[PDB]
């Protein structure tokens, strides 16, 4: 009999149950998160597993419809997601062992305790404390001690577990007709539908460093300037020819360089833009912040927030024994239910975070008309980029002065613009090499190119080659330093944060071009621009229905992923740095080591 016509009925039957089951699970999770209590835990679980159980049974049915006879692209794409076996392809003995090893890795990561030798009776944790030791401090010995303690008391037992985890996951992936586990993670950047928009799993590997070699000239000057400032701060500890140590960056792993802004400020006399005093003086409560955030999206042209968001969402003040988690989140419970969760205060950071979450909510509301299995972004880099665009466009002095939050006689000049641009560069462009290196190392180790013994020596020798960071102390093979990270032991992909940054600036440049703005890109604003609101809305509402290659065609001119806008955004900073580190060396040599 026919297979194409009788799969639509199955999908329609599946959607009706999936919608309400997912709504109940999300409602239980929200009730638990808003009201942390013993009674509201089991119920959440009593929904959760049940939902998962559903996704089991339907999957067993999805295999009964062959995928080589479906002609409709939408139906085939929707059915392909359900046909995935997941981890249910291995035997029960191996599956339970995989679950146990994942659980024990997750538990061990969140139980860090290191006591210093002089007083072995006081240990710290990754929570504020040990993290704070190298987050805000000016010392060399204690930072190195904390670094070594964390990497030798939490990372020395994850290695035997990760060794078996890698091979077990690789076998599981090979059982699903993937050559390794790398293709499983790269499979989401793959489309085999419309002609001319085709993408392949192996194309991304060649496309990553092709758009990375253009950033090295920009990264080298920043590296040289940071090294010069550190030399001016730390005497006789950093060689001018070589590069900088690892524990002096400002974080546990050096993911971000934001904490280093205090030491490497261009101009000290000129202050930054802070409106918190004006926020307090004008008596702005938490409702005013969200009203102002709503006004931005109303002015752009996007639809207005639904009534009920102001009622159900816990906007501010958990207050009394009614405890709650203060992690800002945007909840899409389904059935037209959108909520927010935040512990709002009076701060510019809270203003930007509210803008970010409002952008997330708008993007979630955009594709509400798609079927249940297509209510997601085209890939993982679009959602957070859309979130960050609003934060980018709401920090300009023009927008602050327009809403009556800054003095109208403000006289911004070279100094403040350069300071703000350097502050943003210390966070945005300073993390791309780290992400690229980490993803490259993970892909190589999954592919099996590097054997077991070549684990701790390839990692450092590519860190020095790509990032320009040396090891403060030699690490032998028995260490497992990369596993000492959140998105390395919890089984999370890390390539999203690299493509998200490029998508953010591509979208911002496209909107600024289709907003009639003249001048530098860093002062651009998309407020009051209706034409810029439609162009975005044409791609927000597509969801996962269309390939991401076509998604990058209703906003930007070309469907490729090239880093053009980043080199134009930090153009004044680049041209100032060219004339700044004139009497110094630009580059690093991977021969000098702090220990020898």
């Amino acid at each position: 009999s026919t297979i194409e016509e009788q799969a639509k009925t199955f999908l329609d039957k599946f959607n009706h149950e999936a919608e309400d089951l997912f709504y109940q699970s999300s409602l239980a999770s929200w009730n638990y998160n808003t009201n942390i209590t013993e009674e509201n835990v089991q119920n959440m679980n009593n929904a959760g597993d049940k939902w998962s159980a559903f996704l089991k049974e339907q999957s067993t049915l999805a295999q009964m419809y062959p995928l080589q006879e479906i002609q409709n692209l939408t139906v085939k794409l929707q059915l392909q997601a359900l046909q995935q076996n997941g981890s249910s392809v291995l035997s029960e003995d191996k599956s339970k062992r995989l679950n146990t090893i994942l659980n024990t890795m997750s538990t061990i990561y969140s139980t860090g305790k290191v006591c210093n030798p002089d007083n072995p009776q006081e240990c710290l944790l990754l929570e504020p404390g040990l993290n704070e030791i190298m987050a805000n401090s000016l010392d060399y010995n204690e930072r190195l001690w904390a670094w070594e303690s964390w990497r030798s008391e939490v990372g020395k037992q994850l290695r035997p577990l990760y060794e078996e985890y890698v091979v077990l996951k690789n076998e599981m992936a090979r059982a699903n007709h993937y050559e390794d586990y790398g293709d499983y993670w790269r499979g989401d950047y793959e489309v085999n539908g419309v002609d001319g928009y085709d993408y392949s799993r192996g194309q991304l590997i060649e496309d990553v460093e092709h758009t990375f070699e253009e950033i090295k000239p920009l990264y080298e000057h920043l590296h040289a300037y940071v090294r010069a400032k550190l030399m001016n701060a730390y005497p006789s500890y950093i060689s001018p020819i070589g590069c900088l140590p690892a524990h002096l960056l400002g974080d546990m792993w050096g993911r971000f360089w934001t904490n280093l802004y205090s030491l490497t400020v261009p101009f000290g006399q000129k202050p930054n833009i802070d409106v918190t005093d004006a926020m307090v003086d004008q008596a702005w409560d938490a409702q005013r912040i969200f009203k102002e955030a709503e006004k931005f999206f109303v002015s752009v042209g996007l639809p207005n927030m639904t009534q009920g968001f102001w009622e159900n969402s816990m906007l501010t003040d958990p207050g009394n024994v009614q405890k709650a988690v203060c992690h800002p989140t945007a909840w899409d419970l389904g059935k037209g239910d959108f909520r927010i969760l935040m512990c709002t205060k009076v701060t510019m950071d809270d203003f930007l975070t509210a803008h970010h979450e409002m952008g997330h909510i708008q993007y979630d509301m955009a594709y509400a008309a798609q079927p249940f299995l297509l209510r997601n972004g085209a890939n993982e880099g679009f959602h957070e980029a859309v979130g960050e665009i609003m934060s980018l466009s709401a920090a300009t002095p023009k927008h602050l002065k327009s809403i009556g939050l800054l003095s109208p006689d403000f006289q911004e000049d070279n100094e403040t613009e350069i300071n703000f641009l350097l502050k943003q560069a210390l966070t945005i462009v300073g993390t791309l090499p780290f992400t690229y290196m980490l993803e490259k190392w993970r892909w190589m180790v999954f592919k099996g190119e590097i054997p077991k013994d070549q684990w701790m020596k390839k990692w450092w020798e590519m860190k020095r080659e790509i990032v320009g960071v040396v090891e403060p102390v030699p690490h032998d093979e028995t260490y497992c330093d990369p596993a000492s990270l959140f998105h390395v032991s919890n089984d999370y992909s890390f390539i999203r944060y690299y493509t998200r940054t490029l998508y953010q600036f591509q979208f911002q440049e496209a909107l600024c071009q289709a907003a009639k703005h003249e001048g530098p890109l860093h002062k651009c604003d998309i407020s009051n621009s209706t034409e810029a609101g439609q162009k975005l809305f044409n791609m927000l509402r597509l969801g996962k229905s269309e390939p991401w290659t076509l998604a990058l065609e209703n906003v930007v001119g070309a469907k490729n992923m090239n880093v053009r806008p980043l080199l134009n955004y930090f153009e004044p900073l680049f041209t100032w740095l060219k004339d700044q580190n004139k009497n110094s060396f630009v580059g690093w040599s991977t021969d000098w080591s702090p220990y020898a």
Binding site: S1, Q6, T306, K335, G336, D337
Partner: protein, 201 residues
């Protein structure tokens, strides 16, 4: 004379509970006087659309009998109650002819039908072999057979239960909240006219 023997619109618009959409309730109104002014001037109705005749002139012309069809549907599903429309309701639950004359009234009832734990007392048909003729009711619960393998009244690989239940809750957004719908259809059979509007004095 004085206006008397008013039609019982109270027991229709103010009923304690409404029937499901797949089993919509039909009431026959005849041999009385109908006052549409109170219905039209009321501000409680979210949707009030009259197709065949103008609402302002209802009190003038008068017909022989009226049929009131009452049920409960979703929020965004209201627009399917119109001539020449397609959907899950207009094809499997309630079909209106293209030459329909009458009025459609729909109002939100989220404070009554919705329940915090979920109200599962409202059902609708999801699968059927063929579309419905205008003004046709089907209450059969036979197992639908999508495939070619026969089912002996038992669900399975390609056999589904035709009826599915609504999940109304107070936290549902607009467009998913329950909406109560009453459709008035006027018949003009050649019998002497009985249902006529009041004579203003």
């Amino acid at each position: 004379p004085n206006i008397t023997n008013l039609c019982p619109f109270g027991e229709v618009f103010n009923a304690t509970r409404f029937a499901s959409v797949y089993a919509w309730n039909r009431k026959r109104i005849s041999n009385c006087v109908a006052d549409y002014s109170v219905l039209y001037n009321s501000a409680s109705f979210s949707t009030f659309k009259c197709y065949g005749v103008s609402p302002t002139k209802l009190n003038d012309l008068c017909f022989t009998n009226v049929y009131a069809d009452s049920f409960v549907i979703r929020g965004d599903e209201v627009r399917q109650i119109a001539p020449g429309q397609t959907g899950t309701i207009a094809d499997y639950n309630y079909k209106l002819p293209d030459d329909f004359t009458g009025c459609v009234i729909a109002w939100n009832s989220n404070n009554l039908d919705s329940k915090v734990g979920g109200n599962y007392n409202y059902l609708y048909r999801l699968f059927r072999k063929s579309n419905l003729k205008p003004f046709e009711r089907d209450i059969s619960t036979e197992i639908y057979q999508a495939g070619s393998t026969p089912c002996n009244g038992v669900k399975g690989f390609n056999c589904y239960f035709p009826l599915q239940s609504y999940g109304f809750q107070p936290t549902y957004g607009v467009g998913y909240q329950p909406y109560r719908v009453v459709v008035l259809s006027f018949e003009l059979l050649h019998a002497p006219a009985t249902v006529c509007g009041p004579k203003k004095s």
